[PDB]
Amino acid sequence: GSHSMRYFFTSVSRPGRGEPRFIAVGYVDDTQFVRFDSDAASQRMEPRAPWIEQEGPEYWDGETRKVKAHSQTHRVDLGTLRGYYNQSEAGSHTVQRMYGCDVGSDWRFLRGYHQYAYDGKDYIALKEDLRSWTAADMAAQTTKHKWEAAHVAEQLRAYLEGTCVEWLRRYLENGKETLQRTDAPKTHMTHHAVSDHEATLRCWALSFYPAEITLTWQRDGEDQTQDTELVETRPAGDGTFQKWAAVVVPSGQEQRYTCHVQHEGLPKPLTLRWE
Amino acid sequence: MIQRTPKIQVYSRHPAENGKSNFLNCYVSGFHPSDIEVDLLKNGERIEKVEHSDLSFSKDWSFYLLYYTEFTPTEKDEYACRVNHVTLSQPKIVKWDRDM
Amino acid sequence: FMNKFIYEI
C-alpha cells in the first residue's frame, strides 16, 4: 500500500549552556525504528524496532557516521542562520529538517520530500519535481542560490528516488510482521451522566495501526462534527494508537446517535449504537 | 519567534482495570519551541522512573513527545501530569480520567 | 538509511 520512510532532525542551540541539542528519529510509516540523541551516552544510532537491530555492525557504523555529519552541518547552520537574521548570541534557536520518500502499492517511488525550517517557520523546501526549491524569504533565497550552484537537488533526487526507496523496501521485507500489518481498532462505547437531563456518549477506538482513522458521530444520519469532542490520535506506547469522539446527548436521545469507525484494517466501516 | 501551546492528553495504554498493571501516558503535542517539562504525578507526588519517547514534529513543525510509566491503577489513587512550557503562564496539571 | 551527503544553509 502506500508506505513511507521519513527522517526528522532537530537542532536546538543552547547558548552559554553547551553544545547544541541534536535529535534524529527515523520512521517507517507510523513506526519509529532509529534514533540519535546528542545527550544520550551511546553517541550512536540506536535501534527502536525489533526488525532493525538485526542489521550488522556496518549498518550502525554508517548510520552513526552520517548522523554525526548531520549534527555538524546543523551546528554550522545555527550560526549561519543567526547571522542571516541578525539575531543575538544569547537566544536559543531551533532548526528542523525532515526528508524522506513515499512508495505506492507497487513499492515503487511515489513522492520525495526534503523540508527545512528555522524557529518553527518554513525556511527552504524541495519542490515536488525534486529539481527546484521553494524559499520563504531572502535568506532562504540566498541558500537557494548556494544550493543551486552546488547541484544539491540532483544529489537529493538520486537519494530520494533510489537509495531511499531501496532501503524502504528492505525494511518492509525484513519487518513485515510490524510494518505490513493492519491492526483493526477495538471499538466500544461508554455512557456517562453529566446531569439528570444530559449525558455524554463517548466512542473509543483502541489498538489500531496505522494511525489513520475516522470517528464520526451522527444524529438520525446528520453529521455532528461541530458538536463532537474529537481528540488527536495518540500513541498507546506499544506501537498501536488510540482515539475517541464524544457527544453531549440529551437524556432519552441515545438511540438517535450512531458512531462510525473507518479504518484501513476494517473491511466494512463499523457502526456503533448505544441501545 | 513562533510559540505554540502544548496540547496535553493523560491516558492509559489499556482500559483501566483496578489491580492490573498498565502504562500511564502523558502525550504533549503541537508545541514550540521544544523546551518543555513534563512530570507524571501519583497523588500529587512526582513519579521517579518515567521514560519518554524521542522528539519528533508534525507538518507545522510543532513537536510531540510521549512520557510514560508503568503503574497499577486503583479505585482511590489519583494520577495526573504537570506540564510547563513558555506558552503557559502557569504550569498546567491535567488529571487522569479513566474514560478520556 | 540516511543520505550520505548533507549540504549547509
Numbering used by the authors:
A (entry chain A): 2 to 276
B (entry chain B): 1 to 100
C (entry chain C): 1 to 9
Text taken from the publication that reported this structure:
Whereas traditional therapeutic antibodies have been limited to extracellular antigens, T cell receptor mimic (TCRm) antibodies can target intracellular antigens presented by cell surface major histocompatibility complex (MHC) proteins. We previously engineered and described a TCRm that detects an HLA-A*02-presented peptide derived from alpha fetoprotein (AFP). AFP is a biomarker for hepatocellular carcinoma (HCC), the fourth leading cause of global cancer deaths with a mortality rate of almost 100%14. In prior work, this TCRm displayed high specificity and showed no evidence of off-target recognition.
We also determined the crystallographic structures of the unbound TCRm and AFP/HLA-A*02 complex. Although the resolutions of these structures were lower than that of the complex, electron density was clear enough to show that, in contrast with many TCR-pMHC interactions, there were no large conformational changes seen in either molecule outside of changes in side chain rotamers, small rigid body shifts of the TCRm variable domains, and slight remodeling of CDR1H. The rigid interaction between TCRm and AFP/HLA-A*02 likely further contributes to high specificity and affinity, as more flexible interactions between TCRs and their ligands have been associated with higher degrees of cross-reactivity.
